[PDB]
Amino acid sequence: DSQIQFTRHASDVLLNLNRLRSRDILTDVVIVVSREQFRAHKTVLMACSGLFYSIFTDQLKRNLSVINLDPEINPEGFNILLDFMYTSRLNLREGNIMAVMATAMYLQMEHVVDTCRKFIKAS
């Protein structure tokens, strides 16, 4: 393990990917959540969600430009998790815990799911 470790590099990369998303640069998919639409990078969604990973790894589904989620999926809960994917920061509150946990479970985000379980234990 002779290589030099840059402790800030991963966070710097994520910050710049979020800036790319903010500027709509090289976004290649739209996630439709009821009346709300969210543009993103498939590479990012696959890197953070078991649901999106299982969809785009399949060469048949790889080129999809639009994804539609379950109508019982809360748009604000998806937005909080889309923000998490791009920032490492989760907006967890007692007023949104159940919607956020239901959305993370659906999206197969094991660590968010684990944190939601810890939040409840601490609530």
Binding site for a copy of itself (CB under 8 A): 2-14, 16-17, 20, 25-26, 28, 41-44, 46-48, 56-57, 62, 84-85, 88-93, 111, 115
Question: What is the maximum span of the chain, computed from C-alpha positions, in angstroms?
Answer: 51
Residue whose C-beta lies closest to ligand C0Q: 50
Of 4 and 94, the one with the shorter C-beta distance to ligand C0Q is: 4
Per DSSP bridges, beta strands 29-33 and 36-40 are antiparallel
| Structural tokens at position 113 | 């799911």
Q: Are 106 and 77 in contact (CB under 8 A)?
A: no
- The DSSP 8-state label assigned to residue 19 in this structure reads H
C-alpha–C-alpha distance, residues 6 and 80, integer Å: 28
From the list 1-9, 33-41, 71-79, 106-114, the region that binds ligand C0Q by CB under 6 A is 106-114
Of 63 and 110, the one with the shorter C-beta distance to Cl ion is: 110
Q: Are 90 and 80 in contact (CB under 8 A)?
A: yes
The interface partner of residue 36, options being Cl ion, a copy of itself, ligand C0Q, none and the CB cut-off 5 to 8 Å by kind, is none
Of 23 and 35, the one with the shorter C-beta distance to ligand C0Q is: 23
- The correct pick among 26, 36, 39, 50 for binding ligand C0Q (CB under 6 A) is 50
Collapsing DSSP to helix, strand or coil, 118 comes out as helix
Question: What amino acid occupies position 99?
Answer: A
Site residues (vs ligand C0Q, CB under 6 A): 16, 19-20, 46-50, 53, 108-110
